[PDB]
Enzyme design. Structure first.
Site, PDB file in Angstrom:
ATOM      1  N   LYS B 110       0.837  -1.207   0.000  1.00 31.08           N
ATOM      2  CA  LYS B 110       0.000   0.000   0.000  1.00 31.08           C
ATOM      3  C   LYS B 110       0.863   1.243   0.000  1.00 31.08           C
ATOM      4  O   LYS B 110       0.946   1.974   0.995  1.00 31.08           O
ATOM      5  CB  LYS B 110      -0.955  -0.001   1.197  1.00 31.08           C
ATOM      6  CG  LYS B 110      -2.004  -1.146   1.125  1.00 31.08           C
ATOM      7  CD  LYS B 110      -3.309  -0.783   1.848  1.00 31.08           C
ATOM      8  CE  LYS B 110      -4.334  -1.914   1.746  1.00 31.08           C
ATOM      9  NZ  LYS B 110      -5.694  -1.461   2.161  1.00 31.08           N
TER      10      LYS B 110
HETATM   11  C1  FPP Z   1      -4.721  15.991  -2.696  1.00 33.02           C
HETATM   12  C2  FPP Z   1      -4.594  14.537  -2.353  1.00 33.02           C
HETATM   13  C3  FPP Z   1      -3.238  13.911  -2.289  1.00 33.02           C
HETATM   14  C4  FPP Z   1      -5.694  13.817  -2.103  1.00 33.02           C
HETATM   15  C5  FPP Z   1      -5.613  12.354  -1.754  1.00 33.02           C
HETATM   16  C6  FPP Z   1      -6.801  11.649  -2.372  1.00 33.02           C
HETATM   17  C7  FPP Z   1      -7.045  10.249  -1.839  1.00 33.02           C
HETATM   18  C8  FPP Z   1      -7.753  10.056  -0.530  1.00 33.02           C
HETATM   19  C9  FPP Z   1      -6.663   9.179  -2.562  1.00 33.02           C
HETATM   20  C10 FPP Z   1      -6.898   7.757  -2.097  1.00 33.02           C
HETATM   21  C11 FPP Z   1      -6.203   6.797  -3.055  1.00 33.02           C
HETATM   22  C12 FPP Z   1      -6.018   5.367  -2.567  1.00 33.02           C
HETATM   23  C13 FPP Z   1      -4.614   4.810  -2.542  1.00 33.02           C
HETATM   24  C14 FPP Z   1      -7.057   4.599  -2.161  1.00 33.02           C
HETATM   25  C15 FPP Z   1      -6.973   3.148  -1.683  1.00 33.02           C
HETATM   26  O1  FPP Z   1      -6.701   2.967  -0.286  1.00 33.02           O
HETATM   27  P1  FPP Z   1      -7.304   1.736   0.579  1.00 33.02           P
HETATM   28  O2  FPP Z   1      -7.620   0.455  -0.288  1.00 33.02           O
HETATM   29  O3  FPP Z   1      -6.250   1.324   1.960  1.00 33.02           O
HETATM   30  O4  FPP Z   1      -8.639   2.367   1.193  1.00 33.02           O
HETATM   31  P2  FPP Z   1     -10.144   1.914   0.791  1.00 33.02           P
HETATM   32  O5  FPP Z   1     -10.475   0.439   1.220  1.00 33.02           O
HETATM   33  O6  FPP Z   1     -11.086   3.016   1.744  1.00 33.02           O
HETATM   34  O7  FPP Z   1     -10.345   2.191  -0.919  1.00 33.02           O
END
Ligand code: FPP
Ligand code: ED7
Ligand code: ZN
EC number: 2.5.1.58
Lengths: 407, 323
Positions: B110
């Site tokens: 991640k």
């Molecule tokens: C300006 C700026 C840099 C904004 C950031 C935008 C933002 C929140 C992007 C998220 C991208 C991402 C890696 C999601 C997956 O995480 P995960 O799989 O651990 O979380 P999940 O299960 O809630 O999709």
């Protein structure tokens, strides 16, 4: 009535919102059920303890946590050593939301540190001596704008900043996050945000950028990190917010986006998930719920007659309940969900989302909904930049006194 | 050489082969903010990293040092940049570096920097032959890893590796039919191969989706995919759909089925269907059921929809005020 429960999450009907797995278990349903059971325990804790629920934002605790972190962090933050301007921004913004003043001594120390993070060739790095990168550049500019003094505004080398942005611009309209780095929609938002605030937007800087962002909208209605990818709340916020800055929201199918975001609010937990069939997380209180004000403004500019004049198109009450009951650490700070540890990022975005959920505003019309004690009310935040709307106006006015570099 | 987690790991300030170099303390200024109280090991590695970066020392010892700096903070994109400078300057074997990045990604999947590094390596080598199997192993541990799906799409598209992906998608849908990343991958594959305009394909996809909906009626992913593949042509273009969904009402109902009905009705009204008014009231009835009982978390959305339909499709909507 006396039998009536004023909290949406505690009403007896609410139990009907638990997951129905159709007797088909998969890793997804197992994980969702685990969160729901933990959240139900939180919701029912008052009833089982025979107390009357009182939802209080623990302001003093959050202030103590923030005041200290602004100065010093434990080695738990080693993993964020290349994101120190983000820490400045998250903490200063949280303090702003809590209406806690920034001592001038602190203001000046933040200015000086961010100066050290600024690259000679423009932009800000994650720490002193680090190469510049659009994410800490965005954070640094927001932090300086929250401070809002002449000293703070003067930190930013506008000429070099523009040169930096040009160095990242790609022929297809997208931006690299940094030299030799990855491309995704975050970079478009970071670039649009800092360029619009500091008045360095040239006629061709964002040529093709709106069209590239629109290609990131997919079959779900939300926006993925790059064309083809799954819709996600973080990228959808970045995409819509950048398009609002560029005055090109109409490039998107706003209707399918609206349907997609509203579907991301969890019927049981009350908070938002980042994508379909994943778990609730307090930080989406901003990334997802922050889309509703953006959509309202966009749809309103199209003369949409059916728009509410008092509420956003999400359950403002249920979101506040989730944040207030589930996302507060008793020692101060906020978090992703019960069982997770506090951190400054969730402190920033949980409070940002709480403020959005509390404050509706559409031009002249204003309506607040403050769940729990009235002292819970926060300062409003600007849905595009996520700093105080007063700070946005003050900064844009200031930089408009300067000519766009190159004239 | 000396692993960061080795019991016999020694600080760089204690290593004979680093004696010639003065470490470079971080310059946080006279009165620091957000100052991280680094562990000894962390500060030691980064003081030496700052020294080699500052001097631009392109050496084997600097290359090995980046491995430790990365292990301590894999999000340090400056360290990754310098490591790539060294890979090229020292002419390091890039398959050895592929072995390295596969191990690092396995432990910290991640993280944006690690996946971007792997992409750069594949680009440099012009060799995608390890990618699909590697990504499959990451997805076996976290079937929703966003970076992994993103890298998978890039590899497939850039190297035209489309032939087996539908099969892979079907495998993952069998493991977890609620996996939205996999429904997304299904759309990505079909869109870029046959497309959805081929009637045999569209038919196959709708039947399949209806079959999954019947098996797991409250699975939102299948509902969203059905809507996604029909909506651009317009739901009302498919007159049998309505009746067939109504036929699931009895023992396969959900707020999703109800919402879909409203979407069907909405498009019908937009394309001037027969029985304008009959359809409208059906839609408004459903919006009310959703707002008040079936999907109250979205009450504001459903009231907005009911208001919109009323505003533009009521018999009075096109009637001049004077009438
Ligand atoms: C300006 C700026 C840099 C904004 C950031 C935008 C933002 C929140 C992007 C998220 C991208 C991402 C890696 C999601 C997956 O995480 P995960 O799989 O651990 O979380 P999940 O299960 O809630 O999709
Ligand atoms: C958005 C950001 C800002 C600074 C540094 C990294 C990141 S991020 O792009 O890597 N981001 C945030 C990474 N993240 C993990 C995360 C956030 N929400 C859930 N998680 C697991 C953080 C957690 C705590 C702090 C602090 N302090 C900073 C980042 C990824 C992400 C966003 C939302 C949900 C999941 C992942
Ligand atoms: Zn989060």
């Amino acid at each position: 009535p006396v039998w009536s429960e004023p909290l949406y999450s505690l009403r007896p009907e609410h139990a009907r919102e638990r997951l129905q797995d159709d007797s088909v278990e998969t890793v997804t349903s197992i994980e969702q059920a685990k969160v729901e059971e933990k959240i139900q325990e939180v919701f029912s804790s008052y009833k089982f303890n025979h107390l009357v629920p009182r939802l209080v934002l623990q302001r003093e605790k959050h202030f103590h946590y923030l005041k200290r972190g602004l100065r010093q962090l434990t080695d738990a933050y080693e993993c964020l050593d290349a994101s120190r301007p983000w820490l400045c921004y998250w903490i200063l913004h949280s303090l702003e939301l809590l209406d806690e003043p920034i001592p001038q001594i602190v203001a000046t120390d933040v200015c000086q540190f961010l100066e050290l993070c600024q690259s000679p060739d423009g932009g800000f790095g994650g720490g002193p001596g680090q190469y510049p990168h659009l994410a800490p550049t965005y954070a640094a500019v927001n932090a300086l704008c929250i401070i809002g003094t002449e000293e703070a505004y003067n930190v930013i080398n506008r000429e070099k900043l523009l040169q930096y942005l040009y160095s990242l611009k790609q022929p297809d309209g997208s931006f690299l996050m940094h030299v030799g780095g990855e491309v995704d929609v975050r970079s478009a938002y970071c670039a649009a945000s800092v360029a619009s605030l500091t008045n360095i937007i040239t006629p061709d800087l964002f040529e093709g950028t709106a069209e590239w962002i629109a290609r990131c909208q997919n079959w779900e209605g939300g926006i993925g990190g790059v064309p083809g990818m799954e819709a996600h709340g973080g990228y959808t916020f970045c995409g819509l917010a950048a398009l609002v800055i560029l005055k090109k929201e109409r490039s998107l199918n706003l209707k399918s986006l609206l349907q997609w975001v509203t579907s991301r609010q969890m019927r049981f937990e009350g908070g938002f998930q980042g994508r379909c069939n994943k778990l609730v997380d307090g930080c989406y209180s901003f990334w997802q719920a922050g889309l509703l004000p953006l959509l309202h403004r966009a749809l309103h500019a199209q003369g949409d007659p059916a728009l509410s004049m008092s509420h956003w198109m999400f359950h403002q009450q249920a979101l506040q309940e989730y944040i207030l009951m589930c996302c507060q650490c008793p020692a101060g700070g906020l978090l992703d969900k019960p069982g997770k540890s506090r951190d400054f990022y969730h402190t920033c975005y949980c409070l940002s989302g709480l403020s959005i959920a509390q404050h509706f505003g559409s031009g002249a019309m204003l309506h607040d909904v403050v769940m729990g004690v009235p002292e819970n009310v926060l300062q409003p935040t600007h849905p595009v930049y996520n700093i105080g709307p007063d700070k946005v106006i003050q900064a844009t006015t200031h930089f408009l006194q300067k000519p766009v570099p190159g004239f | 050489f000396l692993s960061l987690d080795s019991p016999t790991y020694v600080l760089y300030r204690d290593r004979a082969e680093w004696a010639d170099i003065d470490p470079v303390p971080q310059n946080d200024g006279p009165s620091p903010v957000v100052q991280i109280i680094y562990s000894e090991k962390f500060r030691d590695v980064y003081d030496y990293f700052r020294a080699v970066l500052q001097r631009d020392e392109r050496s084997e010892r600097a290359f090995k040092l980046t491995r430790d700096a990365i292990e301590l903070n894999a999000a340090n994109y400056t360290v990754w940049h310098f490591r790539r400078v060294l890979l090229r300057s020292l002419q390091k074997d890039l398959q050895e570096e592929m072995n390295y990045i596969i191990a690092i990604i396995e432990e910290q999947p991640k993280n944006y920097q690690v996946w971007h590094h792997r992409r750069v390596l594949v680009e440099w080598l012009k060799d995608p032959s390890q990618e699909l199997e590697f990504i499959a192993d990451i997805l076996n541990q976290d079937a929703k890893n966003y970076h992994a799906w993103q890298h998978r799409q890039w590899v497939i598209q850039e190297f035209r590796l489309w032939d087996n992906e539908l099969q892979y998608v079907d495998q993952l849908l069998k493991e977890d039919v609620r996996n939205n990343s996999v429904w997304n991958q299904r759309h990505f594959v079909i869109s870029n191969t046959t497309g959805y305009s081929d009637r045999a394909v569209l038919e196959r996809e709708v039947q399949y989706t209806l079959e999954m909906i019947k098996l797991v009626p409250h699975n939102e992913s299948a509902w969203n995919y059905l809507k996604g593949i029909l909506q651009d042509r317009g739901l009302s273009r498919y007159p049998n759909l309505l009746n067939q969904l109504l036929d699931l009402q009895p023992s396969h109902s959900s707020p999703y089925l109800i919402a879909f009905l409203v979407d069907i009705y909405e498009d019908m009204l937009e394309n001037q269907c027969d029985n304008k008014e009959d359809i409208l009231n059906k839609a408004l009835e459903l919006c009310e059921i959703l707002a008040k009982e079936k999907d109250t978390i979205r009450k504001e959305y459903w009231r907005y929809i009911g208001r919109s339909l009323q505003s533009k499709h009521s018999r009075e909507s096109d009637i001049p005020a004077s009438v």
